[PDB]
Enzyme design. Sequence first.
Site, short mmCIF file in Angstrom:
data_model
loop_
_atom_site.label_atom_id
_atom_site.label_comp_id
_atom_site.label_asym_id
_atom_site.label_seq_id
_atom_site.Cartn_x
_atom_site.Cartn_y
_atom_site.Cartn_z
N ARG A 53 -12.60 10.57 8.62
CA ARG A 53 -13.92 9.24 8.04
C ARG A 53 -14.86 11.08 9.18
O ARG A 53 -16.22 10.11 9.20
CB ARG A 53 -13.30 8.01 9.26
CG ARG A 53 -12.90 7.29 8.60
CD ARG A 53 -12.31 6.14 9.35
NE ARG A 53 -11.86 5.37 8.44
CZ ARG A 53 -10.70 3.83 9.55
NH1 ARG A 53 -10.85 3.54 10.36
NH2 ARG A 53 -9.82 3.66 8.14
N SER A 54 -13.75 11.00 10.31
CA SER A 54 -14.85 12.20 11.35
C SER A 54 -15.94 13.15 10.20
O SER A 54 -16.86 13.31 11.11
CB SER A 54 -14.37 12.54 12.33
OG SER A 54 -13.52 11.85 13.49
N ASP B 232 -9.80 -1.43 6.30
CA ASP B 232 -8.15 -0.48 6.27
C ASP B 232 -7.57 0.55 4.96
O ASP B 232 -7.40 1.81 5.33
CB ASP B 232 -6.82 -1.19 6.25
CG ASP B 232 -6.79 -1.86 8.46
OD1 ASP B 232 -7.30 -1.64 8.85
OD2 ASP B 232 -5.49 -2.63 8.38
N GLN C 89 -10.92 13.43 3.36
CA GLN C 89 -9.15 13.10 3.00
C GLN C 89 -9.44 13.27 1.33
O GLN C 89 -8.03 13.37 1.06
CB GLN C 89 -8.31 12.54 4.07
CG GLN C 89 -7.93 13.28 5.52
CD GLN C 89 -7.44 12.22 6.28
OE1 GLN C 89 -8.11 10.73 6.70
NE2 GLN C 89 -6.34 12.11 6.70
N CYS D 141 -11.02 10.19 15.11
CA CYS D 141 -10.74 8.45 14.05
C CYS D 141 -9.00 8.92 14.57
O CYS D 141 -8.80 8.62 15.74
CB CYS D 141 -10.94 8.55 12.06
SG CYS D 141 -10.77 10.70 12.03
#
Length: 284
Positions: free
Chosen positions: A221-222, A181, A262, A215
Amino acid sequence: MEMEKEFEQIDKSGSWAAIYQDIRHEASDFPSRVAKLPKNKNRNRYRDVSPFDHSRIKLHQEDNDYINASLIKMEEAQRSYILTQGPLPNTVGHFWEMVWEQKSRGVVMLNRVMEKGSLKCAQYWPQKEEKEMIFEDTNLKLTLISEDIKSYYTVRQLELENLTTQETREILHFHYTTWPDFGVPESPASFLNFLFKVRESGSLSPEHGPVVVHCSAGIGRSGTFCLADTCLLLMDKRKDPSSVDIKKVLLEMRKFRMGLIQTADQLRFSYLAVIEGAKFIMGD
């Protein structure tokens, strides 16, 4: 510079946040006028994450052709990807329209439906074989054919039917279920195992349309997934593998979608994944 030594240098001097801000400063800026039209406000999950006009995927309908999705075309690697947000309750039909029209064979999902106590995307595929989904706005039917649950990921076979023509296609759904998370995984081993399962499926081959990867926002994440895949393919293709510069590849991908990678932690993890993955590509 061999990225493994570049890595240790940055790590010892603790300068990841500084490297990452350099990338943010040099990243392309292109217009996103369609994404910002008032009629499209409820088609965007996040106000600050939009597709560039020049690379956006257009839905084949005269009505409203907008979806929050971008085509990333990596010329030297000969790989293409579509990066998109997790679908919203009102864009599930558009999502599967895009898969149909772009001739994609695989969908890669890097988030759970609920994270940090909030919904991060809609439940856009069926959870039981006998309970299929019909998308009335775009005239498509979606059936769960099989589901294989593993410790770090789940693979599903789906059947997508164009109800207008009754053609059917098999779509493969690759769901990475264990990204934490907060932060990034401690080891890249399970993420690399997952990447090679997608590769082995045939979903990335040029005979098919581009793989769809998402994502929640479709940039973090992508971004990590496509950056690692492209860098590893280039190290395989080139005379000199040490010539692959991960920061240069990331800036090239950011010509096609804003904000890929990010955080400075995601940047560091991408380096780790490529370094460890090379010790399979390069005949170790």
